Amino acid sequence: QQVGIEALSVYGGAAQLELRKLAQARQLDISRFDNLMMKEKAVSLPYEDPVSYAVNAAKPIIDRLSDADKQRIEMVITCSESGIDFGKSMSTYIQEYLGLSRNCRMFELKQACYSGTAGLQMAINLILSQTFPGAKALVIATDISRFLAEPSSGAGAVALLVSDTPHIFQIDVGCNGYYGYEVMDTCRPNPDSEAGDADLSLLSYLDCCENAYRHYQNRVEGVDYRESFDYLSFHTPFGGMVKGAHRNMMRRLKRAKPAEIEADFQRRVMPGLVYCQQVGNIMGATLFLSLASTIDNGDFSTPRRIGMFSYGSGCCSEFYSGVVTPEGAAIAAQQGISAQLADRYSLSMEEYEQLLYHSSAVAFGTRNVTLDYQLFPGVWKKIAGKGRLVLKAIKEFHRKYEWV
């Protein structure tokens, strides 16, 4: 049967910090961030949260649906590690502000950066189950890095509409490998915080990248890591690490020499890194952003197959695949992701640091707060009149949002 992503839309924040400014302010040489292929990170304002991020990512999808198609959305899965409640899913707020049907399953999924992929797969299985033919699912991965790790951690959301008419990404059904085990590589044992080990996290990612793919290879006869995938998209904490993973895979699976590996990297992997470098690590949404980036920056003059590797600390991982056609690539291009990202406010270092200081007022567990939209007037100038959702207030734990 046919299934996959009918529509894909991204929100990469209203503001960003150029990492060269951070390097300069911290006495580091620029070449270290250049080395790791990090350029900019998206930065969340205090009047934004994962809900407003999710809504702004999903809004263009919903705006294009007929009333009838909009009412066919019967599942909303929010995929995040930036939750705002121990029990209430963000999906309830998202449903409210996008005006979706009350006849809709709503919940939130957690497994660090694997959450997005897990949500997508559950959505795929809803359609394949044929329990409710015509039903669509809306899967939104949304995360923010609210500091009260730093150079790589961004903010963003990517919304997927999943259905039996996959205009954007047609899934290779049953072509899935997955692998996980308990490991303390990174975790978030406190609000607005993160603990873990860079090295252990990298080594676990590489172990999973190999084993999840091996499980896919065992299930899909005759697949070849070079020949079967025109592009590869990865969960991308930063580009330099994806370059290392891809190098390791090519070395092991194809015995490729260094020059050919690098050529293969530039051809199949770099396209997916373009938008990643402009937002930073957005956690569970990062692999979906890479897919979007691969689609916009790669060559789709004939249909192409994309291999997808998802990883989440803790850990769990999955390798899967699908096809994008020339028509799907043209639809994706109408989203104007590149122009959105370029139009964001470029923060000075003084502003960035004020922003960190002010983010404390909306920490996890905040009961009452009234946001000052004029914290940064120039940033507001970039948001107002665009039809963006923002967080207006919290009143007795109830979050109130406003279109501006």
């Binding site: 790791l36 080990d197 172990d207 290392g244």
Partner: protein
């Protein structure tokens, strides 16, 4: 197959990954991090040593070494 034997293989790949250390004296007390080699390249050294000893185990089993000596021990034990 011994610590000091492995510790020589670790120094080789370290110099090969970080060429400016080619003539530099390398102690068992030295941390790749402080030398200072970034995480992608520390992993790269580890995987080169693993493949040098054709040692096919999870890469995470080589995590947690605070210097190249402790990493030599870790390798020696497998």
């Amino acid at each position: 197959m011994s610590k000091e034997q492995v510790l020589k293989i670790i120094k080789k790949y370290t110099r090969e990954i970080a060429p400016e250390l080619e003539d530099s004296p390398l102690e068992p007390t030295d941390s790749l991090k402080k030398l200072g080699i970034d995480s992608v390249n520390r992993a790269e050294i580890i995987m080169m040593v693993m493949e040098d000893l054709s040692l096919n185990i999870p890469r995470i089993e080589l995590a947690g070494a605070k210097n190249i000596g402790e990493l030599a021990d870790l390798f020696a034990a497998k």
